Structures are given as structure tokens and as C-alpha cells.
Amino acid sequence: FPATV
Amino acid sequence: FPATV
Amino acid sequence: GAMGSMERASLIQKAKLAEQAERYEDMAAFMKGAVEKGEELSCEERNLLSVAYKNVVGGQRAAWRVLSSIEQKSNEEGSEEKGPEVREYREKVETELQGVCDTVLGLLDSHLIKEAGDAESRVFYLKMKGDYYRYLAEVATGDDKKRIIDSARSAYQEAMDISKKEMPPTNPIRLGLALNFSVFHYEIANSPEEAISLAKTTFDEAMADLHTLSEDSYKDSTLIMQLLRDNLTLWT
Amino acid sequence: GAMGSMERASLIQKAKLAEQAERYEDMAAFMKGAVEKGEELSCEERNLLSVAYKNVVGGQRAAWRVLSSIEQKSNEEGSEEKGPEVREYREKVETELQGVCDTVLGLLDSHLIKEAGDAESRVFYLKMKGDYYRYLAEVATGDDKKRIIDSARSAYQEAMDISKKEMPPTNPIRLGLALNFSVFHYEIANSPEEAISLAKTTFDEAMADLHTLSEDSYKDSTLIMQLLRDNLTLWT
Numbered sequence A, B: 001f002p003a004t005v
Numbered sequence C, D: 001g002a003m004g005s006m007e008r009a010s011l012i013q014k015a016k017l018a019e020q021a022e023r024y025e026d027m028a029a030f031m032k033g034a035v036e037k038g039e040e041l042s043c044e045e046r047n048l049l050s051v052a053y054k055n056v057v058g059g060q061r062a063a064w065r066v067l068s069s070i071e072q073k074s075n076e077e078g079s080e081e082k083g084p085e086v087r088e089y090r091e092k093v094e095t096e097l098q099g100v101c102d103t104v105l106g107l108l109d110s111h112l113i114k115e116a117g118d119a120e121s122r123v124f125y126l127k128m129k130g131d132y133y134r135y136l137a138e139v140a141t142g143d144d145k146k147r148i149i150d151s152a153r154s155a156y157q158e159a160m161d162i163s164k165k166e167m168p169p170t171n172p173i174r175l176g177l178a179l180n181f182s183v184f185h186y187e188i189a190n191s192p193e194e195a196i197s198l199a200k201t202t203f204d205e206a207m208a209d210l211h212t213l214s215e216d217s218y219k220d221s222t223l224i225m226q227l228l229r230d231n232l233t234l235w236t
């Protein structure tokens, strides 16, 4: 899963 | 804190 | 009961799904539903019930400790007044924790314990009764504190007496019961010598019985024995 | 509103306590209460709101993924039929997730966005609007799926257009917006080239502006830049 903020 | 199960 | 319309088997299935999803509040609600069907629980089912509520209350206890610490700091000299909010929120978390403990104790009293005739089930439920009174004791500050502590002690003691008569010293329920009763003595009853004696005697009696075990039973028993040793190392 | 009787300042104070206690559901409820007082939010207050709901929905999303995976496996050839329970429980978690997203989007529409005139606040809330439509999109399977996706895209695009006009390329809100819009392109819009282009261009434009920054601003910006690089490494 990719990084989000 | 001590171990409990 | 919001779970009254759901099949017992469906509740158990969903409890297992909720565990995999780490949805312990749901898991607990499913298992409460299953208990309230009125049938006795299998070993697996007892463990689902215990895992669910352990996780829910464990989270509550951790939060309560954070809040209590903040509150204590607020009442030191030189701490600037911040109003009622810290106490209110600690109380809120406390009340929720007490509610979960009362729910669990309710299930045990209506009617898990009374129907539990086999040593393995009866000891398991009395250990739980001791544990949830111990959690109530951790946050008790008033008139009933001594009675809460004695309720925990009484449940643990009945469990100990049965476990000693009916189970081998390596039985994981017997070990876990002793582990937790030892913690009760150290943390709740202000009896660290009793806690140490219990953990030590339990460890040594288990050690002497390991030879009787299969590899898989050995793994289960030694894991808990290590928890006893960990506590002993902490306390000595 | 169950929080209608509590002071705005008390709600914010309690949100901060709930964060320390890792009680994100409570934190979110406190912040919802604070928003519903009707006053604009400060930067700190916006961050409390976002942290609270990020954690709540993040947990829901993780659970939904576990359940969806189990459900998918159940529909492979050679999978023995287990009844409706997996679908029901996935639906339950899904409905709860959708409810949280609708709550957040509700707060943004009534009336956070319309009152947000400064670039920093307006971009922050439009990014959130994009994010919570993206979460709705992750679980959408029906008639409105395209409209949900377009709602996310539209919010992100408005945010991008403002951020490009009004904020430096190193601004953490601008960076985080681009990070998440890039993920939207990759995971939701089936546009991996757009995702890669966006992450790369955002990284490079930030790199070129780092020289203007204090040590503390540098730390904030480079942290998010590393997240862009992490995604790029994942995707290439």
C-alpha cells in the first residue's frame, strides 16, 4: 500500500 | 507492567 | 440483545472474522451474543470470548493509565490549573471500562459459571471473574474497593483450589491462572512476597511435570512459564 | 449533538487528551463537536480533526481489506461455501466506514469549506474532501462509483489549483496534497503514469525550493518528499 498523509 | 494472560 | 436474531454459529464465525480484522469491539459483541444463546461454550468458544474482552479492556486500561498519569501530574505543586477536563475524561474512560467489566462479569454470573462442571471450563471462567474484578480494582478508590478486591481474590482462590485438585501443574489454564493471581497479589493486594512465592512455586512444579508432555503441550506450557520467570525477574 | 453542551475549548482540550491516550474514536467525536460550534478552525485544530478521522477511517480501511480478501478467496473455484457471513460482516464494516466518510464530508460541506478563505485552510479542507471521497471510492462497486471518483478528483484538482497559485512548492500541505492525489491517480483512477508524473514533478519542484527554508521547515518538507520518493520506488 502506498504512502498518504 | 507485569505479564498476564 | 442486538445479536438476538443472529444464529449462534454465525456469531462464532463472525467473531473469528473480527479477530482476523483486529475488530475486537465487534468480536466481543459477537461473543456476548453467542453466550446469550444460553448454550455452554466449547474450549475454542471460551478462548474467543476471553481474547475479545481482553483486547477491549486492555485498550481501555492503557488509556486510563495515560489519563490517570496526566491527572496525577496536574495535582503536583507548581502545576497550573487546567480545569475539570482531565478528571472528566479520565472518568469517562473509567466508566466505559467499568461497563465492559460489568458486562463480562454479568455473562459469567448469568450463567456461564453455574453451568460449568468440568474443571477446565470452571477454572477458566473463575480466572476470568478474578481478572475482571482485578480490572475494577485497578480503578477503585471508594467505599467498595475492599469488597472489589476480595471478589477478585475469592474467584482466583476458588479457581486455584479446583486447578490444584483437577489439573496437572503444566496445564496452561492452571499456569495462566497462577500468573494472573500472582500479579493480583503484587499489584492489587500489596502482597509482593505472596506474588513471588506463587510465581516461583508454580514455575518449579511445572518444570517437574514437563517430562510428561508432547512437544506441542511442552511449547504451550513453557511459554507461560517464561511469563512467570519474566515477572520474577521484574520483582527480584 | 451529544457534544452540544461542552465548551469548544474543553472539546479541543479533550481531543488532545484522547490523542495522547490513542482514543481516536473519542478524539474524532470531540473534534466533530468542536467543528459544530460553528467557528472556523485554527491550524492546530484542523490538524486535530484530520488526525482523529485519519486514524478512525484508517482502522476501518485496514479491516475492510482483511474482510474483502477473505471474501474474494471464498469466491474462487474449489472454495467450500460458508454462507452469507463473510459478505454480511464486510458489509457491516463497509457501512460503518461509509458513515465516517459521510460525517467528515458533512463537516466540510457544513460549513468548513465555504468559510475557508485563506489558501492554507481551503487547500487543507479540499484535500480532506478528496481523501474521504477516495475512501468511499475504494469500496464503491455500483451506479455512483464514477461520480464518487469524480468528486474526489474535483476536490483534489481545486486544491491543486489553489496550492499552485498561493503556496510554495515546499509547503507541507501542498506536498501532502500532491502525494495523496498521486495515490488517487494510481489506485483509484487507473492512471499510474499520471501518478508517477505528479509525484516526480512535485518532488523536483520541492527540491529546488529547499534552499529558502529554515532547518525546521526543511525537516517537515523533506519528510513528505521522502514519501513521494517511496511511492515512486514502489511504482517504478
Ligand SMILES: *CC(=O)NCC1CCN(C(=O)C2(Oc3ccc(Cl)cc3)CCOCC2)CC1
Pocket (backbone or CB within 6 Å): B005, C042, C043, C044, C046, C047, C050, C120, C124, C127, C172, C173, C174, C176, C177, C220, C223, C224
Ligand atoms: C480451552 C483452553 O484450554 N484454553 C486455553 C488454551 C491453551 C492456553 N492458551 C495459551 O497458551 C495463551 O493464552 C492463554 C489464555 C488464557 C489462559 Cl487461562 C491461559 C493462556 C495463548 C497463546 O499465548 C500464550 C497464552 C490459550 C488457549
Ligand SMILES: *CC(=O)NCC1CCN(C(=O)C2(Oc3ccc(Cl)cc3)CCOCC2)CC1
Pocket (backbone or CB within 6 Å): A005, D042, D043, D044, D046, D047, D050, D120, D124, D127, D172, D173, D174, D176, D177, D220, D223, D224
Ligand atoms: C495547519 C497546517 O499547516 N497543517 C499541516 C502541518 C504541517 C505538515 N504536517 C506534517 O508534516 C505531517 O502530516 C501532514 C498532514 C496533513 C497534510 Cl495536508 C500534510 C502533512 C505530520 C508529521 O508527519 C509528516 C506529515 C502536519 C501539520
Ligand SMILES: [Mg+2]
Pocket (backbone or CB within 6 Å): C007, C008
Ligand atoms: Mg439457532
Ligand SMILES: [Mg+2]
Pocket (backbone or CB within 6 Å): C091, C094, C095
Ligand atoms: Mg469513577
Ligand SMILES: [Mg+2]
Pocket (backbone or CB within 6 Å): none
Ligand atoms: Mg501456597
Ligand SMILES: [Mg+2]
Pocket (backbone or CB within 6 Å): D007, D008
Ligand atoms: Mg462557549
Ligand SMILES: [Mg+2]
Pocket (backbone or CB within 6 Å): D091, D094, D095
Ligand atoms: Mg455496501
Ligand SMILES: [Mg+2]
Pocket (backbone or CB within 6 Å): none
Ligand atoms: Mg501537470
